[PDB]
Amino acid sequence: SWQEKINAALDARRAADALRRRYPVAQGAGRWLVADDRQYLNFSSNDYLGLSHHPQIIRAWQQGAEQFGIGSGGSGHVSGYSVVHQALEEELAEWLGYSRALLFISGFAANQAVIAAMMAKEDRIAADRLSHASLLEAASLSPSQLRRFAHNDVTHLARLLASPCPGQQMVVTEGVFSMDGDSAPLAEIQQVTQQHNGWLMVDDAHGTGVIGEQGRGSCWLQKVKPELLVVTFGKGFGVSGAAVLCSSTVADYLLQFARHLIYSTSMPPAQAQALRASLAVIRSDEGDARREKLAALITRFRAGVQDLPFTLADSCSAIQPLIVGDNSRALQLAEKLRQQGCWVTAIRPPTVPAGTARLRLTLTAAHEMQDIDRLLEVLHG
Amino acid sequence: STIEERVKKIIGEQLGVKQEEVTNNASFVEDLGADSLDTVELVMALEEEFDTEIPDEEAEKITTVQAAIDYINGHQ
Numbered sequence: 377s378w379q380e381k382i383n384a385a386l387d388a389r390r391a392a393d394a395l396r397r398r399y400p401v402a403q404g405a406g407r408w409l410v411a412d413d414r415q416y417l418n419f420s421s422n423d424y425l426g427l428s429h430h431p432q433i434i435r436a437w438q439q440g441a442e443q444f445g446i447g448s449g450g451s452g453h454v455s456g457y458s459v460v461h462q463a464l465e466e467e468l469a470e471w472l473g474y475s476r477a478l479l480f481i482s483g484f485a486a487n488q489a490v491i492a493a494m495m496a497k498e499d500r501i502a503a504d505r506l507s508h509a510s511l512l513e514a515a516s517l518s519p520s521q522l523r524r525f526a527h528n529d530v531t532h533l534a535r536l537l538a539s540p541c542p543g544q545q546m547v548v549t550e551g552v553f554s555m556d557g558d559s560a561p562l563a564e565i566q567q568v569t570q571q572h573n574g575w576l577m578v579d580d581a582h583g584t585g586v587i588g589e590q591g592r593g594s595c596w597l598q599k600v601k602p603e604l605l606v607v608t609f610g611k612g613f614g615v616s617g618a619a620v621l622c623s624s625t626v627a628d629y630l631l632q633f634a635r636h637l638i639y640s641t642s643m644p645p646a647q648a649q650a651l652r653a654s655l656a657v658i659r660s661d662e663g664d665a666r667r668e669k670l671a672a673l674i675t676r677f678r679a680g681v682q683d684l685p686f687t688l689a690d691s692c693s694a695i696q697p698l699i700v701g702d703n704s705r706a707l708q709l710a711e712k713l714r715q716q717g718c719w720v721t722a723i724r725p726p727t728v729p730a731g732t733a734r735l736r737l738t739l740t741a742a743h744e745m746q747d748i749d750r751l752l753e754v755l756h757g
Numbered sequence: 758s759t760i761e762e763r764v765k766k767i768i769g770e771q772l773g774v775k776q777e778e779v780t781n782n783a784s785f786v787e788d789l790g791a792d793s794l795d796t797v798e799l800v801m802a803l804e805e806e807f808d809t810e811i812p813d814e815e816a817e818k819i820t821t822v823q824a825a826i827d828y829i830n831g832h833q
């Protein structure tokens with residue numbers, strides 16, 4: 377029966393002590409985290425630039441509601457394509473140097489729609505092994521062949537593309553990987569992908585707005601323009617949603633064959649107004665200041681953990697994991713940091729390579745030097 | 758009760774035509790007078806008596822009686 381299958385799966389998870397529950401918070405984005413009636417330093421949010429509480433983005437979120445209401449009233453194929461959606465799409469396309477941009481309600485929606493509408497049964501997906509779940513789940517559900525290559529291994533990718541394929545090949549990867557915060561060699565990947573007559577798709581969720589000139593992201597920083605660029609807005613943008621950057625012919629193809637854009641209700645025009653304001657702050661002098669401030673906090677934290685026996689990662693981004701090496705020691709250090717006012721989450725080998733039980737730390741421009749100093753003090757006792 | 762006989766009797770029942778008119782080369786729309794709702798229900802009838810899912814891309818190719826027979830026998 378259905379109930380027997382559900383109870384058996386929950387009992388299997390509860391036996392492995394993976395029955396993880398959600399903890400409600402009053403504030404979860406930015407510098408602070410408010411749980412129960414206690415205030416912590418937030419080191420678990422994706423608000424890499426602190427823009428979730430930016431007054432200009434909040435004002436646009438409010439004035440958009442007073443100008444267009446809340447809901448859009450349908451999908452972009454009917455009456456749900458606001459002039460704000462069009463303005464945001466054009467500003468994103470001009471910002472990242474593409475011809476067209478297509479808005480999506482989330483990064484999941486963007487990745488699922490692109491892979492579903494482009495990959496056929498005779499096609500092949502060459503995905504990085506450490507690709508985020510938003511991209512691997514879509515690639516797995518696709519009727520195309522999924523071929524995972526070693527992390528940032530251009531040689532294995534070349535031997536993967538050289539294999540015979542009855543159709544076209546699509547290489548997907550990330551600009552800034554979400555697990556270890558490391559970047560990908562997009563220049564070498566583009567070269568070997570172009571040599572085998574394939575297209576490149578890059579999900580720059582953790583890099584968009586955070587790195588590059590005007591925060592254009594990883595692809596611009598490495599002087600690479602993939603055929604498909606997916607940027608999400610729930611991290612550095614401090615809002616929500618996503619967008620796919622592509623050419624006019626590819627955009628028309630997706631506008632004709634992706635059921636997400638055809639049927640799913642478009643985002644509220646007020647949310648797009650907040651995205652437009654967030655993009656404006658990202659491209660301004662304040663965007664440069666917040667990116668420089670974040671880099672200074674990262675270098676401050678990496679220099680401070682030089683004494684402890686823990687090891688860092690090849691990450692220059694806001695994601696700064698702290699390798700401990702044991703589940704008990706990592707969970708105990710996480711609780712000790714939470715009792716000292718530093719909200720930190722621990723990741724166990726049930727989800728990452730074994731022996732590398734780490735602390736998922738994230739730094740934001742909303743933090744101050746005293747906050748990183750406090751985090752280092754707690755780590756040093 | 759062979760595969761060809763089951764396919765032909767399914768088409769004859771779904772389209773309300775005698776077994777005389779269901780020829781192997783007989784088209785559903787051209788020769789048997791089938792609205793596209795009847796063709797989709799005919800594919801769904803081929804999915805019931807055979808208990809096999811027919812994808813929509815392959816069901817678009819099934820336009821004649823021999824096409825349905827070749828599909829049922831060619832796949833498994």
Ligand SMILES: *P(=O)(O)OCC(C)(C)[C@@H](O)C(=O)NCCC(=O)NCCC(=O)NCCc1ccc(S(*)(O)O)cc1
Pocket residue numbers: 635792793794797
């Ligand atoms: P005949 O006049 O040729 O009709 C063909 C029908 C029966 C309509 C069918 O073969 C078809 O072409 N369907 C269109 C795509 C589809 O799978 N739709 C399912 C049938 C339908 O019309 N359902 C309504 C809900 C719906 C509306 C729009 C879409 S969209 O993705 O095209 C999907 C489902």
Ligand SMILES: Cc1ncc(COP(=O)(O)O)c(C=O)c1O
Pocket residue numbers: 508509510554555581723736
């Ligand atoms: C794409 C993506 N990767 C990773 C994370 C969080 O990091 P992780 O769950 O791997 O610790 C998020 C948000 O939960 C995310 O959106």
